C-alpha cells in the first residue's frame, strides 16, 4: 500500500477559491460625510425619516 | 480499413468578449451583449 497526491486538481480548485476570495475581501467602499443616526433630543419629523 | 472514429466538438471564434463568472474574473466567450447604456445622442425627443 502507498499514497500519493494529484497536485494539478488541488491547485485548480484552490485557484477558483482564491479568485472568489479576491473578489470579496479586496473591495473598499469610500464614504466621507453622511447623516447622523445618534439623536440627543426628540425632533419629530426629520428624525423619523433619517432613522428609517 | 475496419474501425472508424467519431468525434464530438463545440464551436469557437477568433474574436470573443470577456465575462466574469463568480470564480474567474476573466473568462472568454463567443458573443455577448452589454446591459448598461452609456452613450446619449444629446437631444430630447
Amino acid at each position, epitope marked *: 500500500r502507498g499514497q500519493a497526491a494529484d*497536485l494539478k486538481s488541488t*491547485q485548480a480548485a484552490i485557484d477558483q477559491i482564491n479568485g472568489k476570495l479576491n473578489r470579496l*475581501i479586496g*473591495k473598499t467602499n469610500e464614504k466621507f460625510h453622511q447623516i447622523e443616526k445618534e439623536f440627543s433630543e426628540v425632533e419629530g419629523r426629520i428624525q423619523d425619516l433619517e432613522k428609517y | 480499413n475496419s474501425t472508424a472514429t467519431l468525434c464530438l466538438g463545440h464551436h469557437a471564434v477568433p474574436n470573443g468578449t470577456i465575462v466574469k463568472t463568480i470564480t474567474n474574473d*476573466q473568462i472568454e466567450v463567443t458573443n455577448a451583449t452589454e446591459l448598461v447604456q452609456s452613450s446619449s445622442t444629446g437631444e430630447i425627443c
Partner: antibody
Amino acid sequence: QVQLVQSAPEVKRPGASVRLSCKASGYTFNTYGIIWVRQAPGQGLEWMGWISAYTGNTNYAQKVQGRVTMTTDITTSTAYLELRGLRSDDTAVYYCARGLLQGAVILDSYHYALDFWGQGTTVTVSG
Amino acid sequence: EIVLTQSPGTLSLSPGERATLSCRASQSVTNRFIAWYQHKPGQSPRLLIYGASSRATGIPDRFSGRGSGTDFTLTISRLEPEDFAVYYCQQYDTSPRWTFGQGTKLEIKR
C-alpha cells in the same frame, strides 16, 4: 534564508537560442512559482512569463508567446527559461523573482507579489 | 491590457522632505494587487510595499503606501540617502500577468 541565485552572463548571435537558470534555496520550492521579468537598456521592467513548481502550467507574454519555453525541475529547485529566435531588442537584464503561492488559499497579498529577487543575468545578442 | 501610468516621471527633492509618487490605473483594480517596488542602479529590484498599504518585512516605516481604484500613491518621509532610486508599480491579472510601470526617477539633492 530565502535566496535566489541566477545563471551566468551570456553572449549570443542573432537567431540562436539561450537557456537561463534560476535556483531557489531555503523556502520549499514546490509552494511558490518563479516569475521572469526583464529590463532592456534604458527601459522599464517587462514581464515575460510565469512557471509553477506545483503545476506545470505556464503563461507567457503576448510579444514572446511563440518563442518562449519555460520549465521547472524539483531536483533541485531549478527553473529554466529558453528564448529562441533571439533579436537585437532581446538584449536585456533578466531577473527571476519568486511568485504566487501555489499550495493553499491566499489571503495575504505578500504571495500575490514578487518578493525575493535574483541578481539577474545580462544577455547581449549581436552579430 | 491594464496599462499603468506613473506620475511625476522625474522628481527632485532635498534630503529630509516628504515625497509622493503617483500610479494611475487604466481600469479599476482591487487594493489586493498593485504593489510597489524599488530599483537601485546596478542592483536587483527590491519590494517595498505589497498589497496596497502593507509594509514588507525589513522595510523602514518611513515608507508608506495608500490608494484605491484608479489612483495609488507612495509616500516617503524623512528622505535619507538610501532612498534615492527608481520606483515601479505593478498589478496582477487572474491568469498570471504582471503589467509594470514606466518608472519614476527620484534624482534628488540640489
